[PDB]
Write an enzyme that holds these catalytic residues in place. Sequence first.
Site, PDB file in Angstrom:
ATOM      1  CE1 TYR A 120      38.740  42.603  37.775  1.00  0.00           C
ATOM      2  CE2 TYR A 120      38.250  44.087  39.600  1.00  0.00           C
ATOM      3  CZ  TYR A 120      38.986  43.057  39.061  1.00  0.00           C
ATOM      4  OH  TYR A 120      39.966  42.451  39.793  1.00  0.00           O
ATOM      5  CG  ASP A 124      49.669  31.057  30.219  1.00  0.00           C
ATOM      6  OD1 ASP A 124      49.684  32.066  29.486  1.00  0.00           O
ATOM      7  OD2 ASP A 124      49.642  29.925  29.705  1.00  0.00           O
ATOM      8  CE  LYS A 147      45.803  31.784  27.635  1.00  0.00           C
ATOM      9  NZ  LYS A 147      46.852  30.973  28.315  1.00  0.00           N
ATOM     10  CG  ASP A 181      47.455  41.771  44.544  1.00  0.00           C
ATOM     11  OD1 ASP A 181      47.936  42.824  44.984  1.00  0.00           O
ATOM     12  OD2 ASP A 181      46.206  41.559  44.513  1.00  0.00           O
ATOM     13  CG  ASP A 190      43.046  41.390  40.913  1.00  0.00           C
ATOM     14  OD1 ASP A 190      43.377  42.063  41.910  1.00  0.00           O
ATOM     15  OD2 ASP A 190      42.490  40.292  40.984  1.00  0.00           O
TER      16      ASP A 190
HETATM   17  C1  LIG Z   1      47.636  27.478  24.308  1.00  0.00           C
HETATM   18  C2  LIG Z   1      46.686  28.056  25.401  1.00  0.00           C
HETATM   19  C3  LIG Z   1      45.281  28.297  24.802  1.00  0.00           C
HETATM   20  C4  LIG Z   1      46.566  27.094  26.582  1.00  0.00           C
HETATM   21  C5  LIG Z   1      45.503  27.536  27.564  1.00  0.00           C
HETATM   22  O1  LIG Z   1      45.288  28.745  27.823  1.00  0.00           O
HETATM   23  O2  LIG Z   1      44.762  26.648  28.056  1.00  0.00           O
HETATM   24  C6  LIG Z   1      47.928  26.817  27.273  1.00  0.00           C
HETATM   25  O3  LIG Z   1      48.286  28.043  27.880  1.00  0.00           O
HETATM   26  C7  LIG Z   1      47.768  25.718  28.298  1.00  0.00           C
HETATM   27  O4  LIG Z   1      47.859  25.915  29.544  1.00  0.00           O
HETATM   28  O5  LIG Z   1      47.442  24.632  27.869  1.00  0.00           O
HETATM   29  C1  LIG Z   2      38.698  44.186  46.318  1.00  0.00           C
HETATM   30  C2  LIG Z   2      38.959  43.737  44.848  1.00  0.00           C
HETATM   31  C3  LIG Z   2      37.699  43.990  43.989  1.00  0.00           C
HETATM   32  C4  LIG Z   2      40.135  44.502  44.245  1.00  0.00           C
HETATM   33  C5  LIG Z   2      40.287  44.230  42.764  1.00  0.00           C
HETATM   34  O1  LIG Z   2      40.055  43.103  42.261  1.00  0.00           O
HETATM   35  O2  LIG Z   2      40.567  45.203  42.020  1.00  0.00           O
HETATM   36  C6  LIG Z   2      41.460  44.281  45.023  1.00  0.00           C
HETATM   37  O3  LIG Z   2      41.796  42.926  44.796  1.00  0.00           O
HETATM   38  C7  LIG Z   2      42.527  45.212  44.494  1.00  0.00           C
HETATM   39  O4  LIG Z   2      43.539  44.810  43.852  1.00  0.00           O
HETATM   40  O5  LIG Z   2      42.314  46.398  44.628  1.00  0.00           O
HETATM   41 CA   LIG Z   3      48.870  27.866  30.374  1.00  0.00          CA
HETATM   42 CA   LIG Z   4      44.182  42.552  43.926  1.00  0.00          CA
END
Ligand SMILES: CC(C)[C@H](C(=O)O)[C@@H](O)C(=O)O
Ligand SMILES: CC(C)[C@H](C(=O)O)[C@@H](O)C(=O)O
Ligand SMILES: [Ca+2]
Ligand SMILES: [Ca+2]
Lengths: 364, 364
Positions: free
Chosen positions: A143, A225, A193, A253, A249
């Site tokens: 950020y 992920d 990650k 959410d 973030d």
């Molecule tokens: C193993 C990892 C680096 C990979 C990625 O982040 O692309 C996996 O999560 C995927 O979605 O293929």
């Molecule tokens: C408005 C945006 C920059 C903010 C963030 O990414 O932090 C919002 O999504 C939050 O979660 O407060």
């Molecule tokens: Ca993945």
């Molecule tokens: Ca957010």
Amino acid sequence: SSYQIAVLAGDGIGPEVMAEARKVLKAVEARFGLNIEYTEYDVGGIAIDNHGCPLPEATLKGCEAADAILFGSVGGPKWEKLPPNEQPERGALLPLRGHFELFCNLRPAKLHDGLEHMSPLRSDISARGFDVLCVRELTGGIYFGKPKGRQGEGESEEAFDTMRYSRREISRIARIAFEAARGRRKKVTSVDKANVLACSVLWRQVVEEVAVDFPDVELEHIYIDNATMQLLRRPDEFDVMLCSNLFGDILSDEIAMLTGSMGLLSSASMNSTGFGLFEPAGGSAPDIAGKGIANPIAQILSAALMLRHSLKQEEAASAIERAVTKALNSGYLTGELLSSDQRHKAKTTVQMGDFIADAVKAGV
Amino acid sequence: SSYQIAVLAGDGIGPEVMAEARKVLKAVEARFGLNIEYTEYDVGGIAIDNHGCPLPEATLKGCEAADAILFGSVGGPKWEKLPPNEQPERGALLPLRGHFELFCNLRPAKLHDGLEHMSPLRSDISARGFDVLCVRELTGGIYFGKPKGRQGEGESEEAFDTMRYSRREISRIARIAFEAARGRRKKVTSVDKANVLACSVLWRQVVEEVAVDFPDVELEHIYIDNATMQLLRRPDEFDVMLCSNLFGDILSDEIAMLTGSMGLLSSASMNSTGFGLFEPAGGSAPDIAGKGIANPIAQILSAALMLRHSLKQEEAASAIERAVTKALNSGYLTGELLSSDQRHKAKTTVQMGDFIADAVKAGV
Ligand SMILES: CC(C)[C@H](C(=O)O)[C@@H](O)C(=O)O
Ligand SMILES: CC(C)[C@H](C(=O)O)[C@@H](O)C(=O)O
Ligand SMILES: [Ca+2]
Ligand SMILES: [Ca+2]
Ligand SMILES: [Cl-]
Ligand SMILES: [Cl-]
């Protein structure tokens, strides 16, 4: 002497729910003998309209003069054609966080008893319940990392952002998550990650360093992920989730949405001195603004976080939380918390505020 | 002449499901008169065991000699104590993608009729159904951006990764998503964080540039934290989702999990010349490996993607897809697709492969 609050209600439903937060705060000020003074400053879309930018100097100055910021919500259609980058939401929140070094974002999200039907989870998963606290690092990572910008033209024009974290930044947020887990169910899941990112390799390393001070807290690591998948499936298995800026973030959410009740959720963004900015998890809902429809619980519980974390007024904070609890179990629900056929029992924003403030007064 | 496939089955269930992919491929080779030769190479955990690294030179050389890679799954407990960064999954997939410039990842995810109960969505949401294709940019952004590393020591030690995108990189992935939407429901939702990231500002800009060539396709933009919430709530409103590397990683997985049936989902990662790597969406499931339990449909449908996208064999690809369809509607389900009380009807990995291959042979 008196605590000083900068009130930044912003746009949309921000002012009408803030009015209820202030009402409940008055009941708490009377009950516990707190002397709190409030000053209101424009921020967000109303600040662009009134002052030409989302965070006027005088607003920024008023937050510096305060012990905390009680913040509403910012944004909506009217400023949506501005570049997403002169826009009111990022233009209010990012410099407030940067300026006051609000490195710690606390977003507690739980499935409330009796409101499981509202969660978008399958009924057997929501019936299990959950209670996940997201601890998100708010002032570093991608950020605020430099260099950020663009160079070049045409096909070869390129943009760049730098995700950066130091050991000091990571260990301060991790200690918050561990300390918070100690008080809860004694588990931190750190989310990164580390299979791809140098920042996440150092993140995972440093959180494991911090862990030595918390032998009673279990630590597990998970890839972002995989965390996003697992929250859909088994959110009851997480206690405290510890994330960098961008990952927190998304995940905070996601968890908020899984409750199905965002009008109940609040957020604390705090610095190491205890100053913070306290706001509802949800947005400015400009479609329902001015109608007495909006649920003010998120803004009232933001007031309760402010009393606990910035004003060190634990009993006042918990009295508000109990008054909300009493509302939710005594048929005081706004429209969005009611199944489509019970909708005729909805309470308005003001009825909710009146009830919750009266509960505080009655000594809940 | 003959097409050449490098078969990289990897770890866990990879070999046993690959065996079924190859079986079904044999039925298709006979039915459509394709001459396809296959060579098998170690990759992932088996490659570290057999050759000391997850992507041996000879494996990399065999993929260069091929028209496509038919890829199984990599990873599991045995190599989980390696640094997440000598680990088999990233150590196989990231250099394969980088080496062959596999910039485009296609992950189609749909809720199949009759399998809605398995989705972790609330029943009224899963009953609506969904069909979302994630188009993720696979060779730029923060995965491969430089500088990446760390500097310093002690508290001030810092790690950094750079997210970078050029107009050329963005417009090539966006055109894939628009072309794919044209064939589907004519909507692209591009997913970015343009309120914070310089890369996302350029991303949103360039996707809007590309859009001029697709007047029939609707484009909307959405922030990644909002996309993760909205998929939980209303995934039926998305058609094609277009994402950068890191955002597509998270969102494709989120959508896969929302189907509740990952053993049905496959993935294509392709370069501009039509070479690709085709793999199941799910992992190596080392707990069920060697038991005839694993669902080979994801690996069979990866074979079908390979025939369509790399081998330009559309009829053969669609014959496999129809044979899978026939299995799913003729009581040929493996264990994980069955409600806990119907589990006694489960078919084994081999029974599924035999059925699907026989369907292809019968002219499905
Ligand atoms: C193993 C990892 C680096 C990979 C990625 O982040 O692309 C996996 O999560 C995927 O979605 O293929
Ligand atoms: C408005 C945006 C920059 C903010 C963030 O990414 O932090 C919002 O999504 C939050 O979660 O407060
Ligand atoms: Ca993945
Ligand atoms: Ca957010
Ligand atoms: Cl970050
Ligand atoms: Cl990226």
